[PDB]
Design a protein around this ligand. Structure first.
Ligand code: CLA
Ligand code: CLA
Ligand code: CLA
Ligand code: CLA
Ligand code: CLA
Ligand code: CLA
Ligand code: CLA
Ligand code: CLA
Ligand code: CLA
Ligand SMILES: CC(/C=C/C=C(C)/C=C/[C@@]12O[C@]1(C)C[C@@H](O)CC2(C)C)=C\C=C\C=C(C)\C=C\C=C(C)\C=C\[C@@]12O[C@]1(C)C[C@@H](O)CC2(C)C
Lengths: 41, 62, 165, 205, 203
């Protein structure tokens, strides 16, 4: 249990979770604000 | 007894040393008049994987 | 917005080649569409793609982009006020974010260096402390300025290991 | 020795019967750490109470509709009911209120004695209370916890009804998914003919 | 022991409490040594005073226009407004010339209050705590009453006005109308003129 949490806190698992979430947010931003060549003004 | 006491951190002055300009704990100093009496222990390993070696009195600073 | 021509680049909104680019892509979309009957899902998907292309081309027209002879937008990165959104503002956003990432890393490595076994915590990341330092790194530019002014950003020359030369 | 969640199986070693509704049910050992155990007892208690309130407010409007006092929609249809404010602002204020109250709850969990005095009027809930998750002085407006002998079995009753309502709410969600009406409709439909209508009765495999 | 932003926990060690506004609020530990702490106390003073002035000067044209007694422009297009005594840049350079002197003198005081008027050699500044000069800077000058109370009052009003000024800056960046216009719109339909209708029409 706690050890499993520690296992999750390992570098590979944490890298995979962090990049999964990051890719998710970036994909969602490119879905809701798509095709952004430059910052509008 | 000569040289740094045991337990003190000494700055390495040997130019070729892997831990040059780094700090290491003194483990023991040999008082039998050997050339490199100062045994210094290092947290970080060198390329050979060792964490300690011998230094002279002028190759350390504290 | 209406942008002045610069470096021999006409605005994309009033560019005939930009209109040709839009036209060509839309016609390609129509061709792709024609083989599908309107009721089927690919037909609606292609119509949505056409809509997306139209609104993209429109947004690029309005966003003050300068197009070339080829007909595609060109970025002005010399610092011009009329084209700051091309490089400066996203450049500032990147510099802020990248400095945040780096400062969170520097803070964690310096904090973990005080642990009993720093190298084990290097691979098994203390997630609560890590996240605390990550959110403290929101004010990276300030804290970096403090480190620079106090002289603790940069280690002195004597402490760093160097080659015997 | 005590009754357990599965007779003949030893209760979980990290569970020693010193908690309400302790039946040694933890095959995943999710509460082996006492610090984790405290947090998780609080999670059960909070989810229990919220699920019970959830069942009460998802059943009571439809019961009043059936009786004839007033006309109200189902628990699901209440989401799209048009109120004074849209779902945006209503939820906004709701979440502001819950950030206030749940920060007070959070710091009660961290510090039991903390969050026992009114921050705006100085009213003392309970002078130096330690039982986390059970703020009697703060919420016991009837004095139904003034005796520990009474309080422990009332705690047991709360936990049991809470777990039952958690299962009930999960059932409510699954029933609306699988049938399409409110829970109380589904109940009366099953009552009318348990051999024709119901899961595996309506041929809704 | 001071009144604290988070009553359950305890105040940070580097926040002593005597500071005029110390409510122990420093989650991201920017305080650290007292030296940059003083640089922050003065920074907070300046931001509060300038933002109080900023909120008042961004509201006052709006209040006057909406009441209809002075048809002034909105604060955001105020710079865009034409009719000033000189070109935006010309008065800007004059403005920064005028401010370079005053702000470098304040910096000298920040560095050393004692260090810092030759225009009227008789006119000096009475010695005071850093950031609160007094003397000629307070012609009203009734400090014989409570002091730390009044300083805390200034600081909290400043903190509020800065939150308000950032808020309205975001509000125009997301609505493009005056802050009081936003305010009255929220009065008219509180459930349908709030943040959810913000769209970021223009930066
Ligand atoms: C360091 C180089 C670099 C830079 C500066 C950019 C910058 C950008 N890319 Mg590109 N991209 C890159 C590498 C890069 N990308 C690589 C390696 C790939 C391959 C995976 C892509 C594939 C890619 C796609 C498929 C898309 C972008 C898009 C974008 C925009 C994202 C805007 C946003 O988040 O909203 C921005 C102009 C998006 C966009 O809006 O295009 C303008 C978009 O749709 N990029
Ligand atoms: C789609 C957009 C995009 C993407 C994917 C990347 C991706 C990358 N960039 Mg680039 N970049 C972009 C846009 C992009 N960039 C734009 C628009 C600018 C203009 C501001 C830059 C300017 C820039 C610089 C100057 C550098 C990068 C670097 C990098 C790499 C590491 C960045 C990082 O955060 O590491 C995590 C961050 C850290 C470990 C902290 C390190 C220090 C960071 C990079 C900057 C903070 C220092 C400070 C602000 C002073 C800057 C001085 C500078 C002006 C010379 C990575 C490959 C770096 C690199 O690979 O060079 C070797 C690098 O030095 N980028
Ligand atoms: C703690 C994070 C950190 C920081 C602050 C730096 C900072 C620096 N690096 Mg180093 N570096 C890092 C991590 C870091 N690096 C890692 C993980 C690698 C292995 C890939 C490298 C590999 C590397 C090379 C090969 C070189 C540098 C160089 C540099 C310098 C140029 C700017 C830059 O980062 O561009 C380089 C940026 C990258 C290579 C991108 C990698 C950075 C990643 C994204 C950071 C990952 C850690 C992240 C923050 C999570 C840990 C913390 C978390 C648990 C809380 C600068 C001193 C250059 C140099 O000497 O310049 C003078 C150079 O040649 N770095
Ligand atoms: C989890 C607890 C909970 C929650 C979130 C709600 C939430 C709601 N109830 Mg319910 N309700 C509850 C418990 C709850 N109720 C209990 C315990 C009783 C008894 C009721 C009896 C009740 C009635 C009689 C009515 C509501 C109504 C409402 C709605 C507007 C309330 C305002 O204010 C809202 C969807 C009103 C409504 O319009 O719902 C459709 C309504 O007429 N509730
Ligand atoms: C508090 C307990 C409780 C009570 C008193 C009821 C009472 C009722 N339910 Mg509800 N229900 C419950 C819990 C409960 N349910 C839970 C936890 C679920 C989620 C599985 C459901 C899902 C559900 C559906 C989808 C339906 C009912 C129906 C019914 C009615 C009886 C007819 C019938 O065949 O029921 C059978 C119901 C049960 C035996 C409920 C208990 C669920 C057990 C644990 C079965 C195992 C399910 C499991 C998750 C399957 C997946 C395995 C997979 C992981 C490999 C009656 C009103 C039916 C109805 O309303 O018809 C008018 C109907 O269609 N219930
Ligand atoms: C930019 C203006 C500004 C500045 C310089 C300060 C500076 C200070 N405040 Mg004040 N404060 C401000 C705004 C500011 N605050 C606002 C708006 C509020 C209301 C929400 C408060 C409420 C407040 C309380 C309640 C307390 C302080 C305290 C402090 C001190 C703690 C050291 C520190 O971490 O701050 C240094 C901070 C900065 C240099 C600026 C940080 C900028 C952030 C990190 C980036 C932007 C993020 C944001 C979301 C946008 C310091 C003197 C504590 C104290 O001892 O009182 C004197 C204290 O108890 N402040
Ligand atoms: C801080 C601050 C700043 C930067 C400004 C700046 C400005 N104000 Mg504002 N103002 C402020 C505070 C501030 N004010 C306060 C505290 C009050 C009260 C007002 C009340 C006020 C009025 C009533 C008017 C201005 C006007 C103006 C403009 C012309 C000023 C001038 O002398 O010519 C200028 C954009 C004038 C304006 O709108 O000019 C177009 C104008 O009529 N201000
Ligand atoms: C909520 C607003 C507020 C409050 C309560 C104070 C309060 C104070 N200020 Mg600050 N100040 C403010 C706004 C405020 N100021 C703004 C916007 C500016 C920029 C123009 C200044 C510029 C300023 C300077 C330059 C000086 C003060 C001084 C003072 C002190 C005496 C004069 C005074 O106003 O007290 C009278 C009491 C009041 C309640 C009046 C409030 C104002 C109303 C309109 C007192 C602690 C002086 C000082 O240090 O005194 C020892 C001093 O030297 N303040
Ligand atoms: C003193 C603080 C203060 C006050 C009184 C207001 C008041 C108002 N704001 Mg502003 N706002 C503030 C700060 C403030 N704001 C800050 C800090 C931000 C940046 C996050 C914003 C960003 C913002 C946007 C983007 C919008 C408003 C809008 C509004 C109006 C609708 C109410 C609403 O949706 O709340 C929204 C409140 C927030 C987003 C943050 C909570 C405010 C503070 C932190 C707590 C309360 C004090 C109302 C006039 C809307 C408008 O224009 O109405 C016509 C709108 O579109 N606000
Ligand atoms: C909080 C909760 C429900 C709250 C509901 C609310 C507020 C409902 C409100 C509403 O309806 C109303 C009032 C009126 C409507 O107008 C509006 C809404 C909003 C719709 C449910 C929790 C529901 C929680 C559930 C179902 C949790 C189930 C967990 C289980 C079975 C765990 C089992 C184990 O963990 C143990 C015990 C031991 C381990 O070792 C083994 C395993 C197996 C892992």
């Amino acid at each position: 249990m706690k050890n499993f949490q520690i296992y999750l806190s390992t570098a590979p698992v944490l890298a995979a979770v962090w990049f999964t979430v990051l890719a998710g947010i970036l994909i969602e931003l490119n879905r809701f604000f798509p095709d952004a060549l430059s910052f509008p003004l | 007894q000569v040289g740094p006491p045991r337990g003190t951190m000494v700055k390495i002055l040997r130019p070729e040393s892997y831990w040059f300009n780094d700090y290491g704990k003194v483990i023991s100093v040999d008082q039998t008049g050997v050339r490199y009496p100062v045994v210094v222990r290092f947290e970080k390993v060198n390329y050979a994987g060792v964490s300690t070696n011998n230094y002279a009195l002028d190759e350390v600073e504290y | 917005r209406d942008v002045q021509p610069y470096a021999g680049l006409t605005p994309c909104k009033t560019s005939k080649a930009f209109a040709k680019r839009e036209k060509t892509e839309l016609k390609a979309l129509e061709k792709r569409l024609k083989k599908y009957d309107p009721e089927s899902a690919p037909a609606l998907a292609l119509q949505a793609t056409m809509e997306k292309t139209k609104t993209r081309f429109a947004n690029y027209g309005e966003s003050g982009l300068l197009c070339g002879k080829d007909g595609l937008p060109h970025l002005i990165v010399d610092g011009n006020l009329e084209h700051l959104g091309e490089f400066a503002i996203p450049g500032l956003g990147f510099l802020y974010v990248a400095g945040w990432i780096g400062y969170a890393g520097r803070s964690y490595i310096q904090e973990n260096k005080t642990a009993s076994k720093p190298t084990e915590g290097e691979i098994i990341i203390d997630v609560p402390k890590a996240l605390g330092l990550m959110f403290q790194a929101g004010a990276w530019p300030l804290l970096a300025g403090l480190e620079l002014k106090n002289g603790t950003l940069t280690a002195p020359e004597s402490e760093i290991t160097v080659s015997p030369r | 020795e005590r009754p357990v969640w599965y007779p003949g199986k030893a209760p979980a070693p990290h569970l020693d019967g010193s908690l309400p509704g302790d039946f040694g049910f933890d095959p995943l050992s999710l509460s082996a750490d006492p610090e984790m155990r405290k947090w998780m007892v609080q999670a059960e208690l909070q989810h229990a109470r919220w699920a019970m309130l959830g069942v009460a407010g998802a059943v009571a409007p439809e019961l009043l509709t059936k009786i004839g006092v007033a006309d109200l929609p189902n628990w699901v249809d209440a989401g799209t009911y048009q109120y004074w404010a849209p779902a945006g602002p209503l939820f906004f204020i709701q979440m502001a209120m819950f950030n206030w109250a749940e920060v007070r709850r959070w710091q009660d969990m961290k510090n039991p004695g903390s969050m026992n005095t009114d921050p705006l009027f100085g009213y003392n809930s309970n002078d130096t209370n330690t039982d986390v998750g059970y703020p009697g002085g703060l919420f016991d407006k009837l004095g139904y916890a003034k005796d520990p002998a009474k309080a422990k079995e009332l705690k047991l009753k709360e936990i049991k009804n809470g777990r039952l309502a958690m299962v009930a709410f999960l059932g409510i969600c699954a029933q609306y998914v699988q049938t399409g009406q409110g829970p109380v409709e589904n109940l009366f439909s099953h009552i009318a003919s348990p051999g024709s209508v119901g899961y595996f009765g309506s041929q809704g495999l | 022991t001071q009144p604290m932003w988070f009553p359950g926990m305890d105040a940070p060690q580097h926040l002593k409490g005597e500071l005029p506004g110390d409510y122990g609020f420093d989650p991201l530990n920017l305080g650290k040594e007292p030296k940059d702490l003083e640089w922050y106390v003065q920074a907070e003073l300046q931001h509060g005073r300038w933002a109080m002035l900023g909120v008042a000067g961004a509201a006052a044209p709006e209040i006057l226009t909406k009441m209809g007694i002075s048809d002034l422009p909105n604060w955001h297009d105020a710079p865009n407004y034409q009719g000033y005594f000189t070109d935006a840049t010309t008065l800007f350079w004059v403005q920064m010339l005028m401010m370079n002197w005053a702000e470098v003198r304040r910096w000298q005081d920040m560095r050393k209050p004692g260090s810092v008027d030759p225009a009227f050699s008789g006119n000096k500044l009475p010695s005071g705590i850093v950031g609160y000069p007094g003397g000629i800077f307070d012609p009203l000058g009734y400090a014989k009453g409570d002091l730390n109370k009044l300083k805390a009052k200034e600081i909290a009003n400043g903190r509020l006005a800065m939150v308000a000024f950032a808020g309205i800056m975001v509000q125009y960046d997301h609505t493009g109308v005056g802050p009081v216009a936003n305010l009255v719109a929220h009065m008219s339909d509180p459930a349908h003129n709030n943040v959810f209708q913000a769209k970021f029409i223009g930066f």
